[PDB]
Write an enzyme that holds these catalytic residues in place. Structure first.
Site, PDB file in Angstrom:
ATOM      1  N   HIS A 164      48.240  43.147  30.272  1.00 29.18           N
ATOM      2  CA  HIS A 164      47.105  42.831  29.407  1.00 29.18           C
ATOM      3  C   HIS A 164      46.038  43.915  29.378  1.00 29.18           C
ATOM      4  O   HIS A 164      45.970  44.777  30.256  1.00 29.18           O
ATOM      5  CB  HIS A 164      46.375  41.575  29.904  1.00 29.18           C
ATOM      6  CG  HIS A 164      47.190  40.322  29.891  1.00 29.18           C
ATOM      7  ND1 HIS A 164      47.206  39.446  30.957  1.00 29.18           N
ATOM      8  CD2 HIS A 164      47.939  39.749  28.920  1.00 29.18           C
ATOM      9  CE1 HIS A 164      47.928  38.386  30.638  1.00 29.18           C
ATOM     10  NE2 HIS A 164      48.383  38.545  29.409  1.00 29.18           N
ATOM     11  N   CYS A 265      42.030  36.457  35.791  1.00 30.90           N
ATOM     12  CA  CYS A 265      43.130  35.626  35.328  1.00 30.90           C
ATOM     13  C   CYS A 265      43.133  34.179  35.830  1.00 30.90           C
ATOM     14  O   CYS A 265      43.607  33.267  35.132  1.00 30.90           O
ATOM     15  CB  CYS A 265      44.458  36.314  35.692  1.00 30.90           C
ATOM     16  SG  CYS A 265      44.532  38.087  35.250  1.00 30.90           S
TER      17      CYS A 265
HETATM   18  N1  LIG Z   1      52.692  36.066  35.675  1.00 31.84           N
HETATM   19  C1  LIG Z   1      51.706  35.800  34.618  1.00 31.84           C
HETATM   20  C2  LIG Z   1      50.444  36.629  34.870  1.00 31.84           C
HETATM   21  C3  LIG Z   1      49.325  36.269  33.890  1.00 31.84           C
HETATM   22  S1  LIG Z   1      47.751  37.127  34.258  1.00 31.84           S
HETATM   23  C4  LIG Z   1      52.322  36.160  33.264  1.00 31.84           C
HETATM   24  O1  LIG Z   1      53.254  36.960  33.203  1.00 31.84           O
HETATM   25  O2  LIG Z   1      51.891  35.649  32.231  1.00 31.84           O
END
Ligand SMILES: N[C@@H](CCS)C(=O)O
Length: 272
Positions: A164, A265
């Site tokens: 992200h 998160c």
């Molecule tokens: N393991 C999660 C982390 C989100 S911050 C994902 O892959 O969506």
């Protein structure tokens, strides 16, 4: 900016250890340690900082349910319930939508089946929004975000070699963007500054993931910053430690980082 009264978090399901999505397959998760780290995190938010904590229960069928940030984006009194890029996480929206309804927020759902957006790809500076276009968030998702928060400018930024946009940045203060030093992180930073007519200050750290911190303005405490520890990232911790203008709170998050979960998160902050 940065003020909050409530916070939504969700418990870790045992299935997270082996079944949570992750970009790298390194050290395996120590679930007991992950739970301890989450307790400290929740403890700081609720007890030390006085926020009203809404603790959602874990759902074993949703291994990534602890990462509530990706399912909702809150701006003032409106909450956008996203449509996560990962199919295995879509159902996480249900409980989040219910919790935010109960907090009396105006709810807008991302229903378009051609749109996806992870809240983790959204960086709200208090002045505008930057949205990362990644494997989780597409152009349509970013468009809907802009349509939801019309009073704010929304600009896109490509996310490369990271899950992200916030896998390498976050707000560390009212006009302060914490940012990593990788080639990709710096490219994204230059784009954000190019797209915005506003000049932001930067807090640059050597470890990309240590650029993810939580900034809060809490009455009786002032500007607070939850950041990664000297034990996890010694060189980045040194940068944060110089900050005499923030109440610093080192919070471990090593186990959840194994599944790409960083500090922001694990929570959705609300100012009522
Ligand atoms: N393991 C999660 C982390 C989100 S911050 C994902 O892959 O969506």
């Amino acid at each position: 900016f940065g003020r909050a009264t409530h916070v939504v978090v969700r418990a870790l399901p045992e299935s997270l250890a082996q079944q949570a999505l992750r970009r790298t397959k390194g050290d395996e998760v120590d679930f007991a340690r992950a739970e301890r780290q989450h307790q400290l995190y929740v403890g700081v938010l609720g007890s030390k900082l006085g926020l009203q904590v809404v603790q959602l229960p874990a759902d074993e069928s949703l291994p990534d349910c602890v990462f509530v940030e990706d399912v909702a984006v809150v701006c003032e009194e409106t909450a956008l319930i996203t449509r996560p890029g990962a199919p295995s996480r879509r159902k996480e929206a249900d409980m989040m939508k219910e919790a935010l309804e109960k907090l009396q927020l105006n709810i807008v759902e991302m229903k378009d089946e051609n749109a996806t957006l992870d809240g983790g790809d959204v960086l709200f500076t208090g002045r505008e929004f930057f949205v990362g276009l990644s494997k989780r968030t597409n152009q349509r998702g970013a468009e809907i975000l802009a349509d939801t928060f019309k009073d704010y400018a929304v600009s896109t930024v490509p996310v490369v070699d990271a899950l992200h946009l916030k896998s390498f940045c976050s707000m560390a203060g009212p006009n302060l963007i914490a940012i990593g030093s990788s080639e990709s992180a710096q490219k994204a930073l230059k784009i954000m500054q190019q797209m915005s007519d506003h000049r932001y200050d930067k807090l640059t750290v050597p470890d990309d993931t240590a650029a993810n911190c939580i900034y809060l303005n809490i009455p009786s405490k002032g500007h607070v910053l939850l950041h990664r520890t000297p034990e996890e990232y010694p060189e980045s911790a040194k940068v944060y430690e110089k900050l005499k203008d923030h109440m610093l709170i080192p919070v471990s998050n090593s186990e959840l980082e194994k599944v790409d979960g960083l500090l922001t998160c694990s929570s959705v902050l609300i100012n009522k």
